[PDB]
Amino acid sequence: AARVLLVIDEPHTDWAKYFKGKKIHGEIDIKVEQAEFSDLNLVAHANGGFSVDMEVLRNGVKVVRSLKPDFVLIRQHAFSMARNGDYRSLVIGLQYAGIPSINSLHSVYNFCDKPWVFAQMVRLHKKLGTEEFPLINQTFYPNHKEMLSSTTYPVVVKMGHAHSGMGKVKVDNQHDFQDIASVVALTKTYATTEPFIDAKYDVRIQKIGQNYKAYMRTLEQIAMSDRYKLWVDTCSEIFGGLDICAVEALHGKDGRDHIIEVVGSSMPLIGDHQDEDKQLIVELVVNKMAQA
Amino acid sequence: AARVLLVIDEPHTDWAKYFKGKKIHGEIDIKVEQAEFSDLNLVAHANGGFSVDMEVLRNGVKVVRSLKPDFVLIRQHAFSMARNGDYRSLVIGLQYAGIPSINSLHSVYNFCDKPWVFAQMVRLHKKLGTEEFPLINQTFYPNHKEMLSSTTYPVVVKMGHAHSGMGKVKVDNQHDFQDIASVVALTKTYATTEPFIDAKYDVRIQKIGQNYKAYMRTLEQIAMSDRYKLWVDTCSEIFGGLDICAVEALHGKDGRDHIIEVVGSSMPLIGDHQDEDKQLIVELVVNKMAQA
Amino acid sequence: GAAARVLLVIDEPHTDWAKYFKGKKIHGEIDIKVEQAEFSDLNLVAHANGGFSVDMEVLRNGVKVVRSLKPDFVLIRQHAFSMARNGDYRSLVIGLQYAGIPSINSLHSVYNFCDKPWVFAQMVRLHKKLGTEEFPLINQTFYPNHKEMLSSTTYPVVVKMGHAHSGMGKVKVDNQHDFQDIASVVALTKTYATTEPFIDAKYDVRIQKIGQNYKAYMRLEQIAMSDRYKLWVDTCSEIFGGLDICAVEALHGKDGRDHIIEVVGSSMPLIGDHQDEDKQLIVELVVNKMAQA
Amino acid sequence: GAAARVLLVIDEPHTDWAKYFKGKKIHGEIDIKVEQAEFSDLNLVAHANGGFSVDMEVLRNGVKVVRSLKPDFVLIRQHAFSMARNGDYRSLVIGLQYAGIPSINSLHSVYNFCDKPWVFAQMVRLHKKLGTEEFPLINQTFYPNHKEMLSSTTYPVVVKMGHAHSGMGKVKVDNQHDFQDIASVVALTKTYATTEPFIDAKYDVRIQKIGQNYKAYMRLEQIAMSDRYKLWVDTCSEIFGGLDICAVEALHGKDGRDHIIEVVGSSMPLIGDHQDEDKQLIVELVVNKMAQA
């Protein structure tokens, strides 16, 4: 009797191929089902009964399919106030159904508000100190009202919860800032502002299970240091533990480093060792499925 | 130098009075600031700077006040898709500011989706079993589409995230159910359905710090049992630990008990020992302020 | 070709662990070499930089035979302590932890399991929290030594001495005078003891938990599991950070009630008919842990 | 009138704890009665039903004087073990846990602090995770006993024996031959030992943590705290479920680098000028814990 792994991801990656031949306890095979958040739905009962429906409208000329995923791998962003959608209810549904996940459904749900995730980093920063964990000095605004000025310029204003660059606005002066402030009022949601950092390069330190990799963007794989490891290790402990994550940091011309954010299981695979990362995620998942 | 406690609650309760004379370490006094979620705002910086603004429009003929709360006591519901508002961003702001709270800001934030809270109880139910933890067999619907029938009738449909009864609808038959199903589609949010329980009485088992009380509604204070204690103790462990909480359960004419839900720090104080509860919350908070 | 991950299994020779592990591979690739010895036959040196060595000396036929190894993981199926000559392997447990070697059960739990009443103390806390109706722990008494052993409130009483096991070091005393005799014997052990009301029992029950597999045996007959039984073993399995292999021993007295006596760790004997199936469950557990490290 | 909550403080007579606790009240209402004795002078009986008794016998002037008490809380300021006559109070610690009595530090940590290398083993894990650039732990070697002590890679070397303390049981050996002499002495202790490269040191540093208060002393001069120092003590304070009172001892060698030697628990000596302020910090800590229970 085979185990069913549901992978929530865009079609770009053929997960069935990297999971092929992988067996649980060296006996049980794994059937890989792959879909995007938008193509899934479900019903969950407190008695354990459930059903995850896949597609409806997609290739195959319309078809309704029922799966009973034994495990889930979430490689896609669960929420976005623009071009993505609100899948927070699906995450809730998966948790209600008691389906094991990577990353945990708990972390996925809690990752729905970027500044909520950032708030965790503020606590680590408070504890560790700048010499150990140099978090960028960002400002959170629950509501636009008091967005008067920015202590300096330019300032990057990040609006609501957006990904891959969306919702960001570089503001070079007091007047332009005030314009964006009004736009923030029209969004009916919070936003953050942070000083603009004139950087020499970007660094992303990733952690998949127990495997670490550091890449330098300006992508070149650079050596890991205890400093880098501390950043990602501490970050990987948030929301009960992140199995797949990465810390994005900038290296200022000023010499100082600045931690910008931490990304979860939907973190894009980068560099030229993408097949290594993919294979590591497979071993991680398989191992969790066995011990589940 | 006195400690500042911000209490988020409706005006009904004079918290300043129950906190009067209470001192931290027997030395430091406590200044109690009390407001409703709707009358507060803030700005938080990752460097630790922050400011919680109180009122603007309220008694005193308009006034803007700044507080630097050292601690917060949350006695009000943080989110409601009807008659209350969305204060989830304020909770995020308070966490971003690193302000200690009761209950924890983490639990308060995670309590914003009732079915997400219920999902925790499903896991405990799965683990403990019905003989130990009799959770009602509720059904979660991420999205209306598949709301065809209810295995039985009547069925109580709870819509989105509402409190104090709001958003509930008792549906006695297949046809009326289908009407409500359409209303759920028009809500653009999830809902749950559960079999209607013809009850002899209601029971609410509460836990404030280490003090337990059980009340029976039909309110009469009834003795605690190891069964009752297990329900509330297990429930109090969710989202890292709830300092103030209660489990609502129904006692069916059928003899079987049914756990309905768990409420957080905003749980209403009931019965005739309301001043005891109030005094217990004070000792709890004061103790946390000292060790903070 | 490609090196094998070495698993050290600390157990008596009666069970051939290499056989149940044969063909089992990590990530479906890496082979496992199973080394098996007893605590007595082991020594080690551990450095804080990560360097280490676990040497074996099982004097089986060959005299003074030392075969050195380097374990990637350890499976502890033998009791680490005894108040009898050659009964202390606590320093080895400390050495294994000092070497950072992953284990089942955790080295932390194994070390903490060295004093039975310390383990019992954990159950006392669970009992205090859950209550008798949920967790009926026997009303045992701890004496850090013989000085306060003037009397017991009820007799007969079973007196358990310092570190015994396999039902040893147990003595049932029936009266005040005989109790005072045993009290002197306890002094001669220069160690602590416990006393508990004798429970004339109808049957014994052992609820076991290996990973996520549960089995309940009666005293053998495999009885069904109940939420009550599960709660006992689940709660007990959370002690000392989590026990991967454990079981709760309980009596069903002639009185018609249940009594929790103790909890055993990874060295718990495999009983009943399903001994091979549980051995394989232990194999699957260990392999999966090895893959995670 | 209204009964007082009894606090038992296990410490030598040099510090008058009753004085620093005087007038301190729980919830601003309840009074605290402070009982103070040493481990040697204590015995107890604990029952799983919650019944218990902690009897005192401080033979100060009066012979065979027993004053019985019932502690609501315990403050452990004395080292629970020593490989010297009358050095084992591990059974008392087990008895206190069996009695469910709340403590500072936790009884769990106190019990686990009985074997220094077991405590060190925790630091080895932190060191392995953090790396030398973040957490520079000295490269110490553990020997479960004398048999594997053939040689050391570098000499001189400080050999620390089984359970010593206050800088005792320490021996600096300079060569292969002298090392072999000490190896035999270790055999005569029938216990484990550790060896570490001698570090000719410029100065000593002790980073302490009492609740949320930090202080760093140099060897006395109070130096400022740094994020590096804080990380060392914060990480160390998380061991064994959390240490409320602790400190990390580190050397700054003549070599111009830092070396972490060890971490001490609630029995850590109060040093420097701020001894009274730290005593009061300990008082505030304890009182607040008493109120929570």
Swiss-Prot record, chains A, B:
Q: Which residues carry this modification: Phosphotyrosine?
A: 201
> According to the entry, what is the taxonomic lineage of the organism?
Eukaryota, Metazoa, Chordata, Craniata, Vertebrata
Q: What does this protein do?
A: Neuronal phosphoprotein that coats synaptic vesicles, and binds to the cytoskeleton. Acts as a regulator of synaptic vesicles trafficking, involved in the control of neurotransmitter release at the pre-synaptic terminal. Also involved in the regulation of axon outgrowth and synaptogenesis. The complex formed with NOS1 and CAPON proteins is necessary for specific nitric-oxid functions at a presynaptic level.
> What remark about domains does the record contain?
The A region binds phospholipids with a preference for negatively charged species.
Q: Which cysteines are joined by disulfide bonds?
A: none
User: What is the similarity comment for this entry?
Assistant: Belongs to the synapsin family.
Modified after translation how?
A: Substrate of different protein kinases.
Glycosylation sites noted in the Swiss-Prot or TrEMBL record: 150
According to UniProt, the name of this protein is Synapsin-1
Region (C), start-end ranges: 2-292
What binding partners and quaternary form does the record give?
Homodimer. Can form oligomers with SYN2. Interacts with CAPON. Forms a ternary complex with NOS1. Isoform Ib interacts with PRNP.
Query: Localized where?
Result: Synapse; Golgi apparatus; Presynapse; Cytoplasmic vesicle, Secretory vesicle, Synaptic vesicle
Protein origin, superkingdom: Eukaryota
